[PDB]
Amino acid sequence: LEYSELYPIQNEYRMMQSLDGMWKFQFDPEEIGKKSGWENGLPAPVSMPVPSSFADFFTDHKERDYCGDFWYETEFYLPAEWRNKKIWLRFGSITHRGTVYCNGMEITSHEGGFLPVLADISTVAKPGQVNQVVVKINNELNETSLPCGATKILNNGRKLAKPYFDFFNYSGLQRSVWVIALPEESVKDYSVDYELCGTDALVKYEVVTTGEHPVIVRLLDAEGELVAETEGKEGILQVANARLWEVRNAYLYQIVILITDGNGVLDEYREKIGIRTVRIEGTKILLNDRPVYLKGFGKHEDFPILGRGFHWGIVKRDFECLKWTNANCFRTSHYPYAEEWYQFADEEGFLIIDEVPAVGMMALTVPELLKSHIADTEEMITRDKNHPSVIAWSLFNEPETITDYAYEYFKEVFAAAETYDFQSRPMTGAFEKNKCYPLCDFICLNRYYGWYISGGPEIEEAEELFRDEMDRWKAKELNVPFVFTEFGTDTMAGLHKLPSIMWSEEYQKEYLEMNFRVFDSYEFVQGELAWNFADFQTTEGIMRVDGNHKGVFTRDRQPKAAAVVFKDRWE
Amino acid sequence: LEYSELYPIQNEYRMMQSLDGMWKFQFDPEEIGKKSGWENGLPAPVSMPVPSSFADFFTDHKERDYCGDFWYETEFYLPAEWRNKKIWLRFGSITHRGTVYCNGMEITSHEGGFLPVLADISTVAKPGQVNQVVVKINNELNETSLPCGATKILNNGRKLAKPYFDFFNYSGLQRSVWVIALPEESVKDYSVDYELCGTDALVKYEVVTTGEHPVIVRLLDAEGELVAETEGKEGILQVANARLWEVRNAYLYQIVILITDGNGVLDEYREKIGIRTVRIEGTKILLNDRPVYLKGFGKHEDFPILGRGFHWGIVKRDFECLKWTNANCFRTSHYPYAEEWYQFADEEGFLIIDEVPAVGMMLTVPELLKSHIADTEEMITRDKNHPSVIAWSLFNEPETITDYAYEYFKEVFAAAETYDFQSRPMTGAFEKNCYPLCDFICLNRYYGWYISGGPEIEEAEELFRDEMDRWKAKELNVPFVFTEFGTDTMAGLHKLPSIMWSEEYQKEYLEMNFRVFDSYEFVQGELAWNFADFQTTEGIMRVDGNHKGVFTRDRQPKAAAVVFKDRWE
Numbered sequence A: 001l002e003y004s005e006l007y008p009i010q011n012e013y014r015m016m017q018s019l020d021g022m023w024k025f026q027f028d029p030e031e032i033g034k035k036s037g038w039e040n041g042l043p044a045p046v047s048m049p050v051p052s053s054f055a056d057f058f059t060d061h062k063e064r065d066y067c068g069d070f071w072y073e074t075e076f077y078l079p080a081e082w083r084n085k086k087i088w089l090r091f092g093s094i095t096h097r098g099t100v101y102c103n104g105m106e107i108t109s110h111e112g113g114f115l116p117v118l119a120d121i122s123t124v125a126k127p128g129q130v131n132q133v134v135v136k137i138n139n140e141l142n143e144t145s146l147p148c149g150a151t152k153i154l155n156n157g158r159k160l161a162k163p164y165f166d167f168f169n170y171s172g173l174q175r176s177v178w179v180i181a182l183p184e185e186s187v188k189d190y191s192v193d194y195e196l197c198g199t200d201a202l203v204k205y206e207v208v209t210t211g212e213h214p215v216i217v218r219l220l221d222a223e224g225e226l227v228a229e230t231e232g233k234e235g236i237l238q239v240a241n242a243r244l245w246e247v248r249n250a251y252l253y254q255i256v257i258l259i260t261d262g263n264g265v266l267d268e269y270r271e272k273i274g275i276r277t278v279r280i281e282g283t284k285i286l287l288n289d290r291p292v293y294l295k296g297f298g299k300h301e302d303f304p305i306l307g308r309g310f311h312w313g314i315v316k317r318d319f320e321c322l323k324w325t326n327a328n329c330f331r332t333s334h335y336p337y338a339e340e341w342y343q344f345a346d347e348e349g350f351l352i353i354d355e356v357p358a359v360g361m362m363a364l365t366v367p368e369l370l371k372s373h374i375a376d377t378e379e380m381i382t383r384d385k386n387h388p389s390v391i392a393w394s395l396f397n398e399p400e401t402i403t404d405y406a407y408e409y410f411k412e413v414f415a416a417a418e419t420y421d422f423q424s425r426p427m428t429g430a431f432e433k434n435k436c437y438p439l440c441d442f443i444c445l446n447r448y449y450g451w452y453i454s455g456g457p458e459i460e461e462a463e464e465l466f467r468d469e470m471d472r473w474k475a476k477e478l479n480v481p482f483v484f485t486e487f488g489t490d491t492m493a494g495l496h497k498l499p500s501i502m503w504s505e506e507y508q509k510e511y512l513e514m515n516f517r518v519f520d521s522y523e524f525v526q527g528e529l530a531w532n533f534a535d536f537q538t539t540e541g542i543m544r545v546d547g548n549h550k551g552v553f554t555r556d557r558q559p560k561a562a563a564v565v566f567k568d569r570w571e
Numbered sequence B: 001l002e003y004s005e006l007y008p009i010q011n012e013y014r015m016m017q018s019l020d021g022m023w024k025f026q027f028d029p030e031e032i033g034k035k036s037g038w039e040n041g042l043p044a045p046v047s048m049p050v051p052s053s054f055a056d057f058f059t060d061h062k063e064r065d066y067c068g069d070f071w072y073e074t075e076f077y078l079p080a081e082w083r084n085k086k087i088w089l090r091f092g093s094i095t096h097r098g099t100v101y102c103n104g105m106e107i108t109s110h111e112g113g114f115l116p117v118l119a120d121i122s123t124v125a126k127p128g129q130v131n132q133v134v135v136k137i138n139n140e141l142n143e144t145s146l147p148c149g150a151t152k153i154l155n156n157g158r159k160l161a162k163p164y165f166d167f168f169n170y171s172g173l174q175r176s177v178w179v180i181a182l183p184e185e186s187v188k189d190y191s192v193d194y195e196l197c198g199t200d201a202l203v204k205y206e207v208v209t210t211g212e213h214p215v216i217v218r219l220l221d222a223e224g225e226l227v228a229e230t231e232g233k234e235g236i237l238q239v240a241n242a243r244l245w246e247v248r249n250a251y252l253y254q255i256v257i258l259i260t261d262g263n264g265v266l267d268e269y270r271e272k273i274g275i276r277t278v279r280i281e282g283t284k285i286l287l288n289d290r291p292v293y294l295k296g297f298g299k300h301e302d303f304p305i306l307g308r309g310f311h312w313g314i315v316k317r318d319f320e321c322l323k324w325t326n327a328n329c330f331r332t333s334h335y336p337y338a339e340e341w342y343q344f345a346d347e348e349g350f351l352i353i354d355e356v357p358a359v360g361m362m363l364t365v366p367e368l369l370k371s372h373i374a375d376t377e378e379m380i381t382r383d384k385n386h387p388s389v390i391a392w393s394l395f396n397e398p399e400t401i402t403d404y405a406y407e408y409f410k411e412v413f414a415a416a417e418t419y420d421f422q423s424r425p426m427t428g429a430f431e432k433n434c435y436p437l438c439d440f441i442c443l444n445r446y447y448g449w450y451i452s453g454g455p456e457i458e459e460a461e462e463l464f465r466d467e468m469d470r471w472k473a474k475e476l477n478v479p480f481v482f483t484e485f486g487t488d489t490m491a492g493l494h495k496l497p498s499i500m501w502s503e504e505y506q507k508e509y510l511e512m513n514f515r516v517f518d519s520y521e522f523v524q525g526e527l528a529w530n531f532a533d534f535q536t537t538e539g540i541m542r543v544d545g546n547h548k549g550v551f552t553r554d555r556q557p558k559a560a561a562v563v564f565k566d567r568w569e
């Protein structure tokens, strides 16, 4: 990467200033912004909160459903003391694609709406003055970037997003934005990998910097005491009596990476990490050499009004709910989340399956798609690899028919993931009903026996069909763990029926009980992540009653009857 | 005030750094934090978002309902270049009361949970180093601070808040927190007042600084062009062909206040202001010399999960909803809101009735008065320069009214008059039975809900007309604004014929109220209760809070929202 994915910090060497707040915003349905000089300032903006998705603020359909180009602008004063630093705009994300301008100058563009965008404004920044950032953003969907979809043009020219995925096409500046200053020679990347040695541990590392000066790496315990120190851009930290990061029982060391010259420190990067190993051994997922059974949910970045807008309050409520259910794991369905989610998982001892935005999807275009898929994979892994919480990468969704073309496609994605993950941790994706599972270290299944297949009065048949499929998997004797990454029923809070019906709270309970009976019948099942943690927004349609109601919690984070079912089982 | 209420800005002279994010947090049920060195760091904290109310994150009743002492902590790196400046921690609020520590040192304390707290850390700040802030907060309710209530002790020793008000006792660090650096001589306060002169306008101003150096004041238009400039801490800016700030049609100038030192600048403060006058003339409210009829709502700072936690997204959605209803006004029931609400009202041309936390209640009194006056002074000093703020809501008329009560309110109004450079309208909630104190009268009435609801609604209407006929016969020659009227309404509860709690009844109730309002010339505004369903204390009369919202808590319209939209268009 031509930039650093490292989360921004503030210290003697690195500075940061939040750009979150009310930005100026203007829709650009006629695509006239650039030819009208909007990069120098929007002519008739309204205010738009950042971070937030723009859609749900408005009261008119055409604003909510806006698809096309739209622009953000803000101004910020840069401290004079930032002069002679490398100064960057850092967007948690720009959804889905955009071009960043600063002081009227084009800086960089990015496609991929769920990972950081870094724009080097060193050459155009004006320290000691008000500076301007303008971003042209586009939220259309296509088949060459993730997540895929189409863009319908209504007869009047108005665009409408047509997702190939079951979540609303929220977009905008959905994550925090910073302007930051780094030293001219800085830590750009690092990777850690762990080995357990009796009561001790080794932290193997590599550091990439933007210069050639010596690097010193220190490890501090949770109290800030030095436990290990070594020199070099590659090395091993030896940790005596290591306190391992454990499931739902986190312990976090702090890695401190210093660049030094003859006269002292040039840069210092500091991040909390957790010493833990994850391995697949036969049908077991091993965390620190012990089997762990995954319990939890697929989530979304989704909340009333804010859309996918990041807020620590959503993190806090969601984790309290997760802990209350006795969960230990979530999947970042269906895109990498804001970094803060992983930071918090690290503190709470949650396990994360980190997912690139290619999983949740349902002539020439494929090579470009592969490039985008690989780029998202590289960015996700580079960003997230050092979180102890991240124990697996979810990389793909198996096509109903597997051409040699398709297998070659996925092989490239997995090869790229392997290259970028210093830890070579487990890799997975979503599998069809029964030549790609060789790519995976464990298999994820999304199944809806009792919902989309033989729901309701046919639930007994659904169970039989489910067992038939699982018996086929059993007979395949793949000797890998299977994790259910989706199973659920749309459930309207307050809809009660005796006997139960599809959509009722009681049916959700009964469906889950049936699924559990099946899961528990097969030794190789090693995890269950229900779909979904919470009701979430989708495109409108005859099959979506104000979004997707397969949440175990409501969108405002309150438990339906079935939430207690998980709580009891997972305790 | 021993500190500035001015909203923080960043420029060559003033620096700011946000402390928003995840703080450390710990409950202190045994009240042992200050006895146990917690001002130097919390011993077993959890993470707590700031800004937010803490209550609704948790999954256990005792955490949600926690009442007593609880603590926040964070660390922040202070740039070395802030050295020897006046360095302050600025909290949007600390609810309800608290003591701020920095680097282990007690800095300041504040009582009143809805206005900024400024803590001067100049002498304890560590530039070029990591610094620590710890806040001991308490959310108990009593009768000597606002809003009032009691604190019940369960046999357990566990405290429970018992409000004398109909909103949940949300608390914590509910607004943004900054650390800022100011020049040693700085602009501490300023005030503007307006006069219209044909096509021109006068901006009368006063500036308070912390020194004796000369002051220059400039006014820029919406494009940053200079339209006026004067010298002195007190002066008049003459604005040719002034573009007035108009209802639902804002225009904002920028005032620029410089402290100079020979040929150089010591400080610069800038803020957007709007040139507008508000005056009461007989029973009319005049905005820029034209009658305006207030249309809108009482609101709350209230949203799912966040509680009263500030977020611009809530502001944006709420204003879009307000505009969709064709509203022009809201009241900050029942406490001053985050400053950002007023900034946005200024941009959107909304009129605000700014309310101190005394209005919403349903030996100690001298202490209560001190608190009431302090909140009044802080609110007015903070909010006076917003063009949106057109009135202060200061009191709730007591049932009985004694000579002491009159003296009490006289002191409150006197303080308000002293602090409001514009002397804009002051009001409060009047009973059915202190008129000279007020510029106009607010009525909160529930004829058709609490009185003669449902099958008795026709009796309710007669009772309402009887009261209004009594007000009419008094010929007070002041405007009357209804600041509350509404019915609890469960979204999705439909009934034909309507019943209390149904969406249809909310419509019919509103229609009856409008018929009454429209029968009296002196009625000059209607602010419905409430904009949105909001959280209250649990009880047999509150079905997950208060459902008198025209919108649901998640900001979607009930049937009655359209009634307002059509009427106000």
Ligand SMILES: CCCN1C[C@@H](O)[C@H](O)[C@@H](C(=O)O)C1
Residues within 6 Å of the ligand: A165, A166, A167, A334, A360, A362, A446, A447, A486, A531, A548, A550
């Ligand atoms: C094979 C199932 C795919 N799954 C994707 C997920 O994003 C959807 O929300 C979910 C559903 O609820 O239908 C189906």
Ligand SMILES: CCCN1C[C@@H](O)[C@H](O)[C@@H](C(=O)O)C1
Residues within 6 Å of the ligand: B165, B166, B167, B334, B360, B362, B429, B444, B484, B529, B546, B548
């Ligand atoms: C005189 C004010 C009474 N009013 C106060 C308000 O806070 C309450 O929510 C409301 C109500 O709905 O009962 C009554």
